[PDB]
């Protein structure tokens, strides 16, 4: 919340659009270039997105951005054009079309790896709208976008949803959650980042032991290497030399893990009876990623149960860092770290804003120089005619 309001967004974006173009003229020039099958400058598009007055013209913006990303120059979309489109959505609805072009991703090719994600997220927080902010969290994680502490802003959000979770999670949901715990948590500053790492590693560990290792890394920015529970227990081993864990939810979730891993073993018909889909097709199409020497994780269960029982006896007795709530404590943390990080972003984002204008200026200059050269050579060939 503090980010958006204290950043002075609207003033800068109002200050940005200098171009003075027309929508129908750009649409006809574009449609022409796609008809004759030729490329299109990123300039024409940035203009077309700058000049939108309406929801209908935002529809038209969507269409021409699509039909642009399917054109030879699709790698030439700059940051300021993406920015224009996001801000235009902020002018109108902001909560539908930006999310739709982010979830579409590949087709429209917005890919705003930037403070823009932070911006969108804040404009969700102000207005509530939880679920859509959640999906946007997932897409910011899929693009692995965090060099910015949108992480905390997102970690915050995810952990909100982490309390908002009481439900039986399916395969893909468990995966999504594990990934949104892991990739967003990079945080060395606090215990909460570390215990959310534990949460994630645990969830993904469940995913692995229950279905398959392939289920985990399939489309996700995760690693195919089988050890995951071991990575979590490694983060719990880091506590011998280090102060903090947050460590209530580490307890609760790793308890659910230990409980499903336990329960699956004595009861075969209770736990494992749930997959009936195709036995012959799955036995014939059966593939094994894991080696024979690799020591399948399912055979290491007596050690895991020990470590979580050994380590949890150490941590609470040593670190004494048991949190009374993860949700609230994390909320306080990132709300505390928020303002200074804002104050650091304001300095940079501004210099970017001037840079983008410098680039647009240079490019329009090149457009003009080219057109004038073409007109001079055209007059030179039209006034005095020599051709073979």
């Amino acid at each position: 919340c503090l980010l958006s309001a204290a950043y002075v967004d609207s003033h800068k974006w109002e200050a940005r659009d200098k171009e003075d173009c027309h929508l129908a003229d750009l649409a006809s020039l574009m449609d022409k270039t796609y008809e004759r099958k030729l490329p299109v400058s990123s300039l024409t598009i940035s203009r077309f997105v700058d000049n939108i007055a309406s929801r209908e013209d935002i529809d038209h913006a969507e269409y021409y951005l699509y039909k642009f990303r399917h054109s030879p120059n699709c790698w030439y979309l700059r940051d300021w054009t993406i920015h224009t489109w996001i801000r235009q959505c902020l002018k109108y609805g902001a909560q539908d079309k930006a999310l739709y072009t982010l979830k579409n991703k590949v087709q429209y090719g917005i890919f705003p790896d930037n403070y823009t994600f932070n911006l969108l997220m804040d404009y969700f927080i102000k207005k509530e709208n939880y679920k859509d902010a959640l999906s946007v969290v997932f897409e910011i994680m899929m693009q692995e976008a965090f060099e910015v502490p949108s992480t905390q802003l997102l970690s915050l959000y995810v952990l909100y949803h982490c309390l908002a979770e009481k439900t039986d999670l399916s395969w893909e949901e468990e995966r999504n959650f594990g990934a949104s715990l892991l990739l967003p948590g990079l945080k060395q500053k606090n215990s909460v980042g570390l215990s959310s790492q534990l949460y994630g590693y645990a969830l993904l560990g469940k995913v692995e032991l229950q279905q398959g290792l392939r289920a985990v890394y399939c489309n996700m920015p995760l690693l195919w290497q089988p050890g995951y529970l071991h990575r979590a227990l490694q983060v719990m081993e880091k506590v011998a030399s280090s102060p903090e864990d947050g460590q209530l939810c580490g307890e609760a979730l790793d308890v659910l893990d230990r409980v499903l891993k336990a329960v699956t073993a004595p009861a075969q018909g209770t736990s494992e009876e749930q997959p009936q889909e195709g036995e012959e097709s799955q036995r014939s199409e059966e593939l094994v990623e894991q080696l024979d020497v690799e020591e399948t994780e399912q055979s290491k269960l007596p050690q895991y149960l020990e470590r979580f029982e050994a380590l949890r006896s150490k941590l609470q007795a040593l670190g004494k860092v048991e949190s009374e709530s993860l949700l609230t404590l994390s909320t306080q943390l990132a709300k505390a770290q928020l303002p200074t990080c804002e104050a650091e972003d304001i300095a940079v984002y501004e210099q970017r804003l001037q840079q983008w204008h410098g680039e647009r200026v240079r490019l329009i200059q090149r457009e003009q120089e080219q057109r004038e050269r073409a007109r001079q050579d055209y007059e030179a060939r039209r006034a005095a005619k020599a051709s073979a």
Partner: peptide, 17 residues
């Protein structure tokens, strides 16, 4: 499955009469 956006009508009849 994805359905591409329908063809736009961008005409402003106030600018060109």
């Amino acid at each position: 499955a994805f359905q591409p956006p329908p063809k736009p009508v961008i005409v402003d009849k106030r600018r060109p009469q």
